[PDB]
Design an enzyme around this catalytic site. Structure first.
Site, PDB file in Angstrom:
ATOM      1  N   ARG A  54     -25.644 119.531  29.748  1.00  0.00           N
ATOM      2  CA  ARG A  54     -24.626 119.844  28.750  1.00  0.00           C
ATOM      3  C   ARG A  54     -23.240 119.832  29.388  1.00  0.00           C
ATOM      4  O   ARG A  54     -22.542 120.849  29.409  1.00  0.00           O
ATOM      5  CB  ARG A  54     -24.942 121.201  28.124  1.00  0.00           C
ATOM      6  CG  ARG A  54     -24.436 121.404  26.730  1.00  0.00           C
ATOM      7  CD  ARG A  54     -25.002 122.723  26.140  1.00  0.00           C
ATOM      8  NE  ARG A  54     -24.656 123.863  26.996  1.00  0.00           N
ATOM      9  CZ  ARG A  54     -25.493 124.580  27.749  1.00  0.00           C
ATOM     10  NH1 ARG A  54     -26.810 124.361  27.745  1.00  0.00           N
ATOM     11  NH2 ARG A  54     -24.993 125.548  28.516  1.00  0.00           N
ATOM     12  N   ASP A 104      11.951 121.780  25.143  1.00  0.00           N
ATOM     13  CA  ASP A 104      11.691 120.400  24.745  1.00  0.00           C
ATOM     14  C   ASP A 104      12.148 119.369  25.771  1.00  0.00           C
ATOM     15  O   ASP A 104      12.171 118.173  25.456  1.00  0.00           O
ATOM     16  CB  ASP A 104      12.337 120.111  23.385  1.00  0.00           C
ATOM     17  CG  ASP A 104      13.854 119.937  23.446  1.00  0.00           C
ATOM     18  OD1 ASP A 104      14.522 120.331  24.419  1.00  0.00           O
ATOM     19  OD2 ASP A 104      14.385 119.400  22.466  1.00  0.00           O
ATOM     20  N   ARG A 120     -22.052 137.352  27.748  1.00  0.00           N
ATOM     21  CA  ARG A 120     -21.102 137.164  26.659  1.00  0.00           C
ATOM     22  C   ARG A 120     -21.872 137.279  25.356  1.00  0.00           C
ATOM     23  O   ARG A 120     -22.202 138.390  24.937  1.00  0.00           O
ATOM     24  CB  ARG A 120     -20.356 135.837  26.793  1.00  0.00           C
ATOM     25  CG  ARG A 120     -19.288 135.886  27.882  1.00  0.00           C
ATOM     26  CD  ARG A 120     -18.144 134.941  27.617  1.00  0.00           C
ATOM     27  NE  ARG A 120     -18.601 133.569  27.404  1.00  0.00           N
ATOM     28  CZ  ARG A 120     -18.210 132.513  28.114  1.00  0.00           C
ATOM     29  NH1 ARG A 120     -17.350 132.640  29.122  1.00  0.00           N
ATOM     30  NH2 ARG A 120     -18.686 131.314  27.812  1.00  0.00           N
ATOM     31  N   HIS A 177     -26.039 129.389  29.489  1.00  0.00           N
ATOM     32  CA  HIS A 177     -24.826 128.895  30.127  1.00  0.00           C
ATOM     33  C   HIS A 177     -24.621 129.618  31.456  1.00  0.00           C
ATOM     34  O   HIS A 177     -24.900 130.818  31.576  1.00  0.00           O
ATOM     35  CB  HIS A 177     -23.636 129.076  29.175  1.00  0.00           C
ATOM     36  CG  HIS A 177     -22.419 128.296  29.560  1.00  0.00           C
ATOM     37  ND1 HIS A 177     -22.470 126.981  29.965  1.00  0.00           N
ATOM     38  CD2 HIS A 177     -21.113 128.653  29.598  1.00  0.00           C
ATOM     39  CE1 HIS A 177     -21.248 126.563  30.240  1.00  0.00           C
ATOM     40  NE2 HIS A 177     -20.406 127.559  30.030  1.00  0.00           N
TER      41      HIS A 177
END
Ligand SMILES: Cc1ncc(COP(=O)(O)O)c(/C=[NH+]/[C@@H]2CONC2=O)c1O
Ligand SMILES: Cc1ncc(COP(=O)(O)O)c(C[NH2+]c2conc2O)c1O
Ligand SMILES: [Ca+2]
Ligand SMILES: [Cl-]
Ligand SMILES: [Cl-]
Ligand SMILES: [Cl-]
Lengths: 371, 373
Positions: free
Chosen positions: B220, B312, B132, B164
């Site tokens: 992490r 809703d 990435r 990562h």
């Protein structure tokens, strides 16, 4: 801006004028619940009223009080009230209240007595949705209570309302049945000596496709935002008002055989170039769009590759590059420039565009283009 | 008197951070609180994690770091996702650590050090396979030469090396070992070029809990701080999900067999029954695709959703048994599961996603609230 949901108020104006043409002599209540279906209730309301909407509709008194706090003075109707609500603030802020049970009416009347302010009341009746409307057998008792309350100046009997079972199917006979049931409710009111000022049943789909079922007011939501109430018909002369876009944060080279993003679910079949777009599913980019959506960059469709992350995803730019860091990627919009539409996202995710436009958030800052 | 809430149990956060610290062994812990604490509240979660033994905080953006600083957080905060051309000055002045993922980004940072006169506390984010952002092996030597000159004039403190993992949820896969070895290679390149990083960190929640053999100087974790299992197939891994989404029952009503419910009448009652109206919907983050699939917990019993989820609101079936629900009662949509309620993982399974996305969804009428530890 990192990313933005630009709301073209010129499109809102156009859509409201189109809706008024379809509504004919019926007044228009613009539905701006859920913060204007994600477009901003106050700004949409101001534009809609300026384009000739007569009234505003929201779900909650809280939504109506927010409009009032922003300086809106036009009529506002709220129709979904939780148990325990204090109707007093609504009354003091000249918010219309739709009641859907005798309990709610009694609650409203206690608030009228406490504030000294007559309630401008609408009654919400069930004609088929089977959600919170008053049913036929309970309607007469509500009419009697309303008439007695009216006879002592406690309420103004403004409205009768109901809502359609189909948001997107104007040809289904349940539309006709609901209109006939609505007429029967009005006949019940007549029998109990009660006259409402206005009656309204129509959503966007009914307004635009079943004018034969229009009563005194229409209550369009989705079409105000330019999203087709009957997607199979095309855009129905409306212009979707929201464009979601974001800046290209990184352009990166990839060699054939390299995996991308979590799990390496996409492997480059060729040397190519990717763009990092720094918004993700916490910003409303549905994770299920991964590997299916396209974006528009400098006039070209660029497909997403790999998984959508919480705050970013990758698109394939192809193999010399025509895209630079800082360039604009359009995720969806009206389609004028060839970009995908909210309906395209809805199709990919298996949902409806209503849900697409209530999704952008987080790093996607809402902005406005003036009419 | 809230209509709906996302209740974050800070005692669960504390528990989860203590569990993560045990698994971390000799490593310190950076709590990842990006995306407003994965929807749980970055500031409140950060404060709790720090009191439960977190040493540092991790966020994506400088903006997220500045929000923590504005809320009175003084602990170390590292930000690792920056748009091109960012002015790093505000970060420097607010004592925000900056992870750089390219030579160009380092140049931007050093330009800001020059403008402000403030030393940058720098972490280098390297690419070990995610592909990435992150500095690649080809560029790392040049990065080290540049950092050495910057360190010599105290323009930077060389705090961290980070990368990562490609798998957030499969600790056994061999790519984990490959990435850890590539990460060691970056560290060895630095050491051989005489560039000393204070700390190195590679481990997300999955690695922290399931691959202690791959732990470097810091871990992490994000998802496990919120109690959500980083390896769902292994169960709760001793963690407690900290978010409970609940709402008040707005209406109870009886209905008759053969009556349809909600838009399109996609559910038609097979029998006389009782329903409840729950006044939250897909604009509040109740994924519309949950319709006809989800269950809620009310007074100890599972009640399935019936009909479409609306913008809703949605309906649930209480059944035709003796009515044991009143308006104003509490319906739990998801939580840790302690009372038999569904979990966020259950939602993830139903809609085909991951609980990360579930917990970043609640919003609108679902007000975030806190239970203290
Ligand atoms: C650089 C870095 N380091 C640690 C973590 C924490 O990862 P988790 O422990 O698995 O939550 C993250 C978070 N990543 C989010 C999770 O969802 N998708 C993402 O992109 C991260 O970007
Ligand atoms: C009482 C009432 N009146 C008019 C409209 C406007 O409906 P529409 O023109 O279809 O946007 C709505 C909106 N209803 C919904 C949109 O998404 N989920 C919903 O439940 C409404 O609740
Ligand atoms: Ca109770
Ligand atoms: Cl409603
Ligand atoms: Cl109804
Ligand atoms: Cl580079």
């Amino acid at each position: 801006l990192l990313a933005e949901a630009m709301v073209d108020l010129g499109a809102i104006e156009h859509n409201v004028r189109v809706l008024r043409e379809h509504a004919g002599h019926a007044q228009l209540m613009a539905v701006v619940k859920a913060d204007g279906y994600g477009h901003g209730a106050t700004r949409v309301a101001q534009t809609a009223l300026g384009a000739g909407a007569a009234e505003l509709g929201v779900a909650t008194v809280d939504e109506a009080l927010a409009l009032r706090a922003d300086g809106i003075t036009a009529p506002v109707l709220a129709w979904l009230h939780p148990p325990g609500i204090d109707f007093g603030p609504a009354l003091l802020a000249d918010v219309q209240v739709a009641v859907s049970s005798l309990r709610q009416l009694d609650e409203l009347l206690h608030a009228v007595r406490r504030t000294g302010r007559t309630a401008t009341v609408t009654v919400k009746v069930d004609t088929g949705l089977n959600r919170n409307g008053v049913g036929p057998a309970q309607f007469p008792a509500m009419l009697t209570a309303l008439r007695q309350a009216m006879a002592e100046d406690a309420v103004r009997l403004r409205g009768l309302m109901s809502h359609m079972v189909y948001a997107d199917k104007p040809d289904d006979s349940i539309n006709d049945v609901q209109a006939q049931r609505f007429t029967a409710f009005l006949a019940q009111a007549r029998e109990q000596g009660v006259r409402f000022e206005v009656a309204h049943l129509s959503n966007s789909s009914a307004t635009m496709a079943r004018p034969d079922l229009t009563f005194d007011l229409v209550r369009p939501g989705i079409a105000v935002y330019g999203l087709s109430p009957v997607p199979a018909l095309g855009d129905m002369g409306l212009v979707p008002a929201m464009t979601v876009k974001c800046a290209v944060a990184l352009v990166k080279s990839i060699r054939a055989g390299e995996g991308v993003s979590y799990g390496h679910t996409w492997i480059a079949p060729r040397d190519t170039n990717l763009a990092l777009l720094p918004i993700g599913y916490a910003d409303g980019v549905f994770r299920s769009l991964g590997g299916r959506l396209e974006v528009l960059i400098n006039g070209r469709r660029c497909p997403g590759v790999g998984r959508i992350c919480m705050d970013q995803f990758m698109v394939d730019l192809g193999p010399p590059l025509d895209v630079a860091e800082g360039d604009e990627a359009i995720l969806f919009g009206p389609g004028i420039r060839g970009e995908p539409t909210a309906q395209d996202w809805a199709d990919l995710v298996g949902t409806i565009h209503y849900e697409v436009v209530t999704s952008p958030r987080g790093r996607i800052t809402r902005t406005y283009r003036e009419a």
